[PDB]
């Protein structure tokens, strides 16, 4: 599972029942080239992701747009009101109602 990551030559090694097998200094050379080749492959595949990642953030930010406001203003009311005679009155009284 670990070797899953890294911009490393997924060739140069080999697994087996008790251990992994690894090249150096040739196979070592191979991998390296390989490594660069994934930055490409990778670096490019990262980007889109990154890109895309934020692209979903905008869709959320935007949705949220109003639900906030609603929350925003809504609170403010209360902070003002809660100290108002008439509103306290309504409050004690609000229950006797049906």
């Amino acid at each position: 599972k670990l070797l899953g990551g890294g911009d490393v030559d997924h060739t140069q090694y080999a697994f087996g029942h008790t251990k992994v097998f690894f090249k150096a200094g040739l196979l070592g050379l191979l991998e390296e080239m390989r490594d660069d080749k994934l930055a490409e492959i990778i670096t490019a595949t990262q980007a889109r992701c990154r890109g895309f990642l934020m692209r979903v953030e905008y869709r959320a930010m935007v949705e949220r747009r109003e639900s906030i406001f609603c929350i925003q203003y809504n609170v403010r009311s209360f902070m003002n009101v809660k100290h108002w005679p008439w509103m306290k009155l309504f409050f004690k009284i609000k229950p006797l109602l049906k």
Partner: protein
């Protein structure tokens, strides 16, 4: 203003207007406060309530005065709607630091100082953003329940 909220203000207008003529005068304010237990209600409190209106307190003057003070008033079902979108997996009260970061970083109305005032009477859970629901109660009907 939804129509059941306007009917709640019509019922509160009828309980404060004990002469039932459609205009709450200063005697109605004093006799509603005396029937709630306020034997010491000063005349200056009644005059400050009447000083918020430009005319007599009929039903449409009481609705416009409450409209202009409650320009961001939100019913409990829409506050719980927004808190169910903030906790989209249901049941759990959301973290204290998550509501402080999301109030600030989205809007200027969610700036910190205001967040310290939110924690300050809206207690811990409420303030913290963990519980939920008690804050929707006290935003639609004030004071400790």
């Amino acid at each position: 203003f939804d129509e059941t909220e306007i009917e709640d203000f019509k019922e509160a207008f009828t309980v404060i207007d004990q002469n039932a003529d459609g205009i709450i005068d200063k005697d109605d304010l004093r006799e509603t406060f005396a029937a709630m237990g306020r034997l010491n209600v000063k005349n200056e409190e009644l005059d400050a309530m009447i000083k918020e209106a430009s005319g007599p307190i009929n039903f449409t003057v009481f609705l416009t005065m409450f409209g202009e003070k409650l320009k961001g008033a939100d019913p409990e079902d829409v506050i719980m709607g927004a808190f169910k979108v903030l906790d989209p997996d249901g049941k759990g009260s959301i973290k204290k630091s998550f509501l402080e970061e999301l109030l600030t970083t989205g809007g200027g109305r969610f700036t910190p100082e205001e967040i310290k005032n939110m924690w300050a009477a809206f207690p811990p859970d409420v303030a913290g953003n963990v519980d939920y629901k008690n804050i929707c109660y006290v935003i639609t009907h004030g004071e400790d329940a």
